[PDB]
């Protein structure tokens, strides 16, 4: 099975006249074996366009953001979702945003509903008087299996 969500922020966060604005990728998971892939463009991958981009959490996908009160808090994903396994590598590179892409697959059984987030934020980059956009991933997990 090659079921896969892809949040590709490459052409979503480039500086434009209306920027900065929020680009949201909503990931709805209520089936087993769903793979999630998030592409966050690297600083310097293209000249000027991502000079001040930023990804949160740095330890994604092992660490994610979750909403406590109004405050986003970093939490271990393996704590929120028991039985989660993360591939150490993705296409022979470290599974970390520092390589430009992260991936993870949720386990075949999830008992508790959970929502967590990633951030790929280019709103602090300026080029030709235009500002980049702020990207956000929301993973919505419903119990399944």
């Amino acid at each position, epitope marked *: 099975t090659n079921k*896969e*969500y*892809v*949040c*590709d922020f490459t052409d979503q966060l480039k500086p434009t006249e209306s920027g900065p604005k929020v680009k949201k*990728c*909503e990931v*709805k998971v209520n*089936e087993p074996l769903i793979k999630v892939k998030i592409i966050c463009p690297l600083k310097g991958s293209v000249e000027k366009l991502y000079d001040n981009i930023e990804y949160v959490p740095k330890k994604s996908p092992y660490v994610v953001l979750t909403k406590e009160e109004t405050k986003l808090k970093e939490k271990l994903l393996s704590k929120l979702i028991y039985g989660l396994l993360i591939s150490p590598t993705v296409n022979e590179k470290e599974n970390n945003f520092k390589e430009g892409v992260i991936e993870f697959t949720l386990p075949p059984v999830v008992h508790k509903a959970t929502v967590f987030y990633f951030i790929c934020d280019n709103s602090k980059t300026e080029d030709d008087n235009k500002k980049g956009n702020r990207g956000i991933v929301e993973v919505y997990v419903e119990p399944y299996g």
Partner: nanobody
Amino acid sequence: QVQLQESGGGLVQAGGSLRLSCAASGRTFSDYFMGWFRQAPGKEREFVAAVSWSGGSTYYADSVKGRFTISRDNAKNTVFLQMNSLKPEDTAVYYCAGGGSYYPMSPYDGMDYWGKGTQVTVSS
């Protein structure tokens, strides 16, 4: 490979309902996130709705959310688009599509197969 064929289009009155269907050939239907797109007169083609591999999750364009609903029958290789409270602005050619990967921020990006479309005309 996979071929998609839409059916169910026709003339409807404003305020009515119409259900579209889309059949897929082969034996890999559940490998595909399925979706509906449309092209209205004088416009570019736009996203309408999508339904996940198992049928468990659905996405809807803001222009139709609440009025249209999508579902699938993996035992019959069919996707359905239920339209309620049809408006003249819903007149369009409706296109079926599918792909193994789904791009929520840009739903056309992951589509690898496309039907030929079926016309829906809403008169008032």
